[PDB]
């Protein structure tokens, strides 16, 4: 099989349905920030592979994945049990549309996500190129429960202290977690908050316009479609195809199987 077999380095469970893990990374595995790759486990004679956004920075020699834990999900029912040292199959060629090159120059980069959709954005917010290209980077992470706001500490406390671009992070990264079913400082769906302009008021930024604002949307199919429409409502135009820069990019965080 032409798959990499990486080794789990660490695992961290965020809550009952979310966990992340880091694995070794084959030097041959190159990827652009935002991309996903197939990862999985050998099950009953065949790799059980699923598309996974690489949540780690593309210049670090390890991979990190932010994962859902579906009770009876073929892969995650097993993946949730990953432990240090475990093998993880990883495909050789990443892919995906959430890449910097396909966003026209702009001033603000909105990373609109829900659930595990924040995964590729974890890579984005750790990518120096993100800060080279934007004045502001807004990571919106919409979840149902506060416990699902995975990486909170990393985003708000660790990343800003990053030895090399923590200053860029402090100056440019706005983290806007959103919770919809539990008391939280920022309540609601980002679609609604953007339509009302509340999201931008909350983060101290002007409403979006096609000239200044770019976005990457990664979330549930439903959110993806509606958020895309919201951005369209502001006059932004999605990149029509890879290699063809646009105002925003989208990728489903998952698909209903
Ligand atoms: C481009 C792309 C990138 C992806 N990146 C990630 C990632 O970084 N992390 C991750 O956990 N998953 C990601 N997914 C989903 C992932 O590929 C699998 O669906 C996941 O790993 C669950 O596999 P499964 O075999 O356990 O359950 P599956 O049979 O895949 O899915 C079972 C059911 O789980 C729900 N489901 C699956 N994945 C999710 C999810 N992430 N969040 C909420 N509900 C979900 C749906 O209701 C689905 O029908 C991605 C999917 C695509 C298409
Ligand atoms: N197929 C879909 O499009 C879809 C979408 C959402 C959930 N689900 C189901 O519920 C499970 C958990 O899905 P999830 O991972 O994304 O967790 P989720 O909790 O269901 O969604 C996380 C966040 O996304 C928000 N959201 C949902 N729909 C939205 C929309 N159209 N626009 C903007 N924000 C939206 C939710 O608000 P609310 O609390 O108001 O829902 C919540 O804050 C999935 O495994 C799936 O079975 C499916």
Euclidean distance between CA atoms 68 and 63, whole angstroms: 16
Domain boundaries, the chain: 1-95, 96-257
Cα 184–Cα 130–Cα 153 angle in degrees, nearest 5: 35
The CATH number of the structural domain formed by 1-95 is 2.40.30.10
CATH: 1.10.540.10, 3.40.50.720, 3.30.160.100, 3.40.50.80. Which one for 96-257?
Answer: 3.40.50.80
* Deposited experimental method: X-ray
- Residue 162, φ and ψ in degrees, nearest 5: -50, 125
- Whose CA is closest to 152, among 52, 9, 14, 36? 14
Cβ burial, residue 140 (10 Å; 0-12/13-18/19+): buried
Q: Pick out the residues of the known binding site.
A: 50-53, 66, 68, 75-76, 116, 143-144, 180-181, 189, 222, 226, 254, 256-257
Looking from the CA of residue 68, the nearest atom of ligand 2 is 15
Q: DSSP secondary structure string, 20-32?
A: EEEEE--TT----
Q: Residue 115 C-alpha to ligand 2 middle, in angstroms?
A: 8
- Residue 190, φ and ψ in degrees, nearest 5: -70, -25
Helix (H) or strand (E) holding 41: strand 36-43
The distance between the two most distant Cα atoms of the chain, rounded to a whole number of Å, is 54
Q: Pick out the residues of the known binding site for NADP(+).
A: 143-144, 180-181, 189, 222, 226, 254, 256
Nearest CA to ligand 1 atom 34: 70
Cβ burial, residue 46 (10 Å; 0-12/13-18/19+): exposed
């Amino acid at each position: 099989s032409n798959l990499y077999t990486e080794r789990v380095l660490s695992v961290h469970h965020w809550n009952d349905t979310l966990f992340s893990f880091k694995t070794t990374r084959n030097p041959g595995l190159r990827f652009k920030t935002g991309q996903f790759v197939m990862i999985g486990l050998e099950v009953d004679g065949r790799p059980l592979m699923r598309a996974y956004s690489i949540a780690s920075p593309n210049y670090e020699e390890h991979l990190e994945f932010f994962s859902i834990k579906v009770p009876d999900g073929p892969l995650t029912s097993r993946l949730q049990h990953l432990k240090e040292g475990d093998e993880l199959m990883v495909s050789r060629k990443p892919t995906g549309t959430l890449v910097h090159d396909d966003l026209l120059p702009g001033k603000h980069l909105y990373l609109l996500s829900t659930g595990t959709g924040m995964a590729p954005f974890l890579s984005v917010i750790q990518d120096p190129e993100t800060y080279e290209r934007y004045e502001k980077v807004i990571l919106v992470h919409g979840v149902r429960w506060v416990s699902e706001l995975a990486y909170a500490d990393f985003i708000t406390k660790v990343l800003p202290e990053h030895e090399y671009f923590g200053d860029q992070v402090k100056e440019k990264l706005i983290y806007y977690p959103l919770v919809t079913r539990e008391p939280f400082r920022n309540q609601g769906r980002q679609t609604d908050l953007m339509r009302s302009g509340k999201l931008f008021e909350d983060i101290g930024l002007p409403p979006m316009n096609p000239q200044d604002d770019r976005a990457m949307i990664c979330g549930s199919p439903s959110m993806l479609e509606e958020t895309s429409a919201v951005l369209d409502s502001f006059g932004l135009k999605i990149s029509p195809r890879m290699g063809e820069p646009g105002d925003y990019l989208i990728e489903r965080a998952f698909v209903e199987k």
